[PDB]
Symmetry: D2
Subunit: 386 residues, 4 copies
């Protein structure tokens, strides 16, 4: 009954189940978790692996020998459980030095520090076997218009990512980068606020093949955008390197609800797309168990992430396999959308009088699209009524 196993490739950040529940208006409601205990607990739930910021694993300001002890204990728990580390990232947002950003801070010495802190963790990520290195520029942005010249900031952002690409190529590392967009919070506006802006920026880097996106359900929904549409564009560009799964109820602060909560039908269409397109990367949950919960609620919330993915996968597969849905998809001309508009070429199109001079525009206009019947078949499948 919807039991996950490590072959489902479900992963969690240490910072997710480890969130102590401090929000802008309240103190922590839960004690800190030891990273080793989170690995063991997630393994028992059926997770495939974990992800980390540098500062989740090694407390900021650790000596080189404290650092080695923290890594050794962690590696022992991975060895004991079979858990993998497919992704890692840098914390360039918590410490006060990053209050105006890391890569695009106005102060040049902070930008250099940010790059050195990042490079140190790329080495550790490669050592632990990560294939993707995520960058979330949560402090790159502004609350006011004159504080940040955005063209200069984009020059600095490109400079930073180009240097990171020079570093991993010169070291011979097999790792790729994924940029995680967010439109706002904690800055009033954040640079590269959506999947689209991030994809566009990547095409201006010196080695674009090293960079993709790590979209997050809730972040695109904080701009009111359709998250499965944005994922489709990332897959179309060949840039979906990683994904953050969670839930969000509309345009408000980043809630990071468990996956399946928030916009349930968008979750269904997302799973349909990921499974249809054959996405093979980790199914990563970036979520926060609500601060109302104790530790039993933390693990129930994490289990629910995986459960909802597996229920929606079953319902989406049943939808696509249903002969009546296949009939309805042809009724709505999804087959024709997949055929070229003008494989005969430009000149043939220009000479084709059935495309304009003799085209019966009123008869084409009268054809219903039959989209509502198709969508109710999708609803029946989602609700198990079919």
């Amino acid at each position: 009954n919807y039991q996950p196993t490590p072959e489902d490739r479900f992963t969690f950040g240490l910072w997710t189940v480890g969130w102590q529940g401090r929000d802008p208006f309240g103190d922590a409601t839960r004690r800190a978790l030891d990273p080793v205990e989170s690995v063991r607990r997630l393994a028992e739930l059926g997770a495939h692996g974990v992800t980390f910021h540098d500062d989740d694993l090694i407390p900021f300001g650790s000596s080189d020998s404290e650092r080695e002890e923290h890594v050794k204990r962690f590696r022992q728990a991975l060895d004991d459980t079979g858990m993998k580390v497919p992704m890692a990232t840098t914390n360039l947002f918590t410490h006060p030095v990053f209050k105006d950003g890391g890569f695009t801070a106005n102060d040049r010495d902070v930008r250099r520090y940010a790059l050195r802190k990042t490079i140190r963790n790329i080495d550790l990520a490669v050592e632990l076997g990560a294939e993707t290195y995520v960058a979330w520029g949560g402090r790159e942005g502004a609350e006011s218009g004159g504080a940040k010249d955005v063209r200069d900031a984009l020059d600095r952002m490109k400079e930073a990512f180009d240097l990171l690409g020079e570093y991993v190529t010169s070291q011979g590392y097999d790792i790729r980068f994924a940029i995680e967009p967010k439109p706002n919070e904690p800055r009033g506006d954040i640079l590269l606020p959506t999947v689209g802006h991030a994809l566009a920026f990547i095409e201006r880097l010196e080695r674009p093949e090293l960079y993709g996106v790590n979209p997050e359900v809730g972040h695109e929904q904080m701009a009111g955008l359709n998250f499965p549409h944005g994922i489709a564009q990332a897959l179309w560009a060949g840039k979906l390197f990683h994904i953050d799964l969670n839930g969000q109820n509309g345009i408000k602060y980043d809630q990071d609800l468990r996956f399946g909560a928030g916009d349930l039908r968008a979750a269904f269409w997302l799973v349909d797309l990921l499974e249809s397109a054959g996405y093979s990367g980790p199914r990563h949950f970036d979520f926060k168990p609500p601060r109302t919960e104790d530790f039993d609620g933390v693990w129930a919330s994490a289990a629910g992430c995986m459960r909802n993915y597996l229920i929606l996968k079953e319902r989406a597969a049943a939808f696509r396999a249903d002969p009546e849905v296949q009939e309805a998809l042809r009724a709505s001309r999804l087959d024709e959308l997949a055929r070229p508009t003008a494989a005969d070429g430009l000149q043939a199109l220009l000479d084709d009088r059935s495309a304009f001079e003799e085209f019966d525009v009123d008869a084409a206009a009268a054809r219903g699209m039959a989209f509502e019947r198709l969508d109710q078949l999708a609803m029946d499948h989602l609700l198990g009524a079919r």
Copy 2:
């Protein structure tokens, strides 16, 4: 006192002052304007030129000889007034045949018709001297998840724009294309919903140098995004071919208020950026005089568009020239944001102990950014209090 002249390059769509006031809940409140009368009236107000959809100028279904008469009358009014036509576009959204889109309609024969209708108007636009051809795919999208496979739709969208680029290159035309994003309305979600998504899509076309964006103030604000930030990214990419200026009060239906209405401080920062970056294209107003107004209100609203641009241009120039603002910009390290992070290169950065091992993180963190004083100088300048 803030009087426009044609050298300010203010342009208006025929459909703007010509909007009859029909909305989803009400009939028209104004009679139709003759395009010739709109040209003459806008010229008297100080406009530089006008723009048009094919169907604004030539009623849909006109014979080839009615077409010639409509164009001749129009050309005579341009000759009489000195007005230019810098941009033109196609109506692929009003007629019922386009109810599921033009370039990405599921029906293949509609897609071919859409391309033929577009090509016919590119010829006319070149004849009238337009330098930019805008595409707004207002019907390209969906209300439900199964109606539109977005990867196939993006294939069809790329196919259409590639064919248009083959057409203008084979004809030897000096015209470029600009894609106008909008996130929603009239479709539940529209493909290429923001500036970012459009910029990313352009980089996958066969001849990307022919395509840029035509962002609209209100459209990016319907997703809660920072419009001057998005314009900066378009300028950074070298893709700001055209712009639509108007006003919008937040996340709701597309209001198309006169420019300066809506988010006034965003309008100030937009003008600052366009003038600082030396944008030389048309300052185009895509706005709707509210349906409360009679024809005297139409021309007052149009005049207000230009007036507000010129007031904000004056205030932004005073801001940037003020020695006290120049001092504050250095106080906030805007000068340092413009300097390379690591012109010394990767290896020097790695060997620079002042970038990490000896970096005094607490002393850097203690430095205030002085952004609030800078922003209050900007407010004082905007309000004329300085």
Copy 3:
């Protein structure tokens, strides 16, 4: 299998299935329906009744004898089908005379006309057996700040509703009024924009017992509000006289999708509340079949409204009856929320040292709320996984 019958009390506006598909950017895609054919078709689908604006049933400007013929034909179709008319309303938004409002138009003569048009239709509604008369003030509002003094406008709004209440009391009619809030569209901001503002306004009318609310799913969601929470407050006040059911995908133009579309989990919690609280009024669908559809799609969309209500009713009933959910509700202390805080009274509370001086705040804080496990049981029930 989820078949509606008239005892389920599903009703539809004539303007819903009759929407021709004209939106702000496009012409109609469907021909007009005769009201008689809509009654017959809805009866065959299992509807209980229909609702109407005056102008849906009697074309604007009809002679008194054309009026009588339109009503007679309509009454014959009701007699032939068994369909009821539980609600009626006035169109104070389509005609250009209402461009600045009806009850709160700045022009006094328009306000008087609006009241006379309303009163004429109250007589007809009573004749057809309606129990509720809805007012939706879609044009009452403003696009700019100086156009409307809102205190004077609220005086005029109160004046109008007080006169309508004087009219129905002096006539001896058994009808009540329901105010339908909407935050915006077609005006930039609409007066009484949410359920809350409407409830507050009612308490200042001379005969508040005659007035309640008619909330609409999509309208509260256009302000990002929780629609089941708002309905609970209306039920708490005893003011839920009628309800408009449909779907909406977040903060954007009013989509009026079929019920169950949009925010599916909010639809589940709404049905749970209406059924638990014993709401006995009509389940009215104010929805628009998308303009992509032909007439077969219109009736499929209408059928889907009813189907989704009945599926969600079944799932909500299964949730509330499940012993494991009953256990979880006590685990989360829903039983304690229903018990008085201080039935012992103020003085006893003040003297109760276990409420403050001896209250163990850390032990209370440590108690998990168990809300995530409860919510996953609700998800399992919704998806039929339980």
Copy 4:
């Protein structure tokens, strides 16, 4: 030049300039301020007074003698500076015990504790001379649908406020209560989410005359609502007891920018209304100096709050006094909006054939409202261009 003095009645919360800059993603960037130093600094800037939560002034868990020392030091600074304390409030949101609310927590013992903590601070507020006691129920709400039966929660909310009203009446205190709405954050949805919902709830309390609202600019804008419209409704009801002034850029997390930032034109229309209606309460700033700033930026931001109010007051007064604006207001029939619709009464309206049978609907419809010219005069005045 726009210098505040204590007669302008500008007040600040201790928690505003005292915000250390901890947000959901980052540590504090500023040290804690001593309340005594904040009083002295605000007095030098021209403030009239300060406000406080119980826990801002007396650290949580203080002994009764530490409590007395904290109050004495505070009272000495008030005596030294002339500063007043017009409002006070309770912190029912920071401590983990309040994670599911105070007055509407599911656990009954937490609800009793919340009432005792509140009552203790009402006594102190009266001792310091406060006239208004604010309640902001920031934790009253839910992230999921089954966690909170909202009708039971409203019963508990009414119970709590009724007991507080019994307490202040039995003690003979001259203090009134003001409910501060917020739609979301830190709970997914908060009960009483807007001004309207709060006004409606007050009318169901046992002694409604003791309760009003304390609306906040940014909170109504987090629901996309028009804040001057909501204030007008509160003034119309006679319930504007207090106000929180700040700025917000649209629908996102609560930014609490300095007043004048965010939606500048809404700030202009708010000041116009408050000054026109003769609001005599405190002009209270609930704002957060951005965490980019050091302490010099804190005081610059606070000074800017007051400066922007005084600039906007001048511009609004110039607007209303301008004979050309007075002419335009009559042109737009604002004078007619203030006149009764039907002072002649219902029967006269029914007998008035010029209100319906002989009303020339097309001639009324043709009249322009002249709202755009009026709004451009308002823009010219705001920008000092007039």
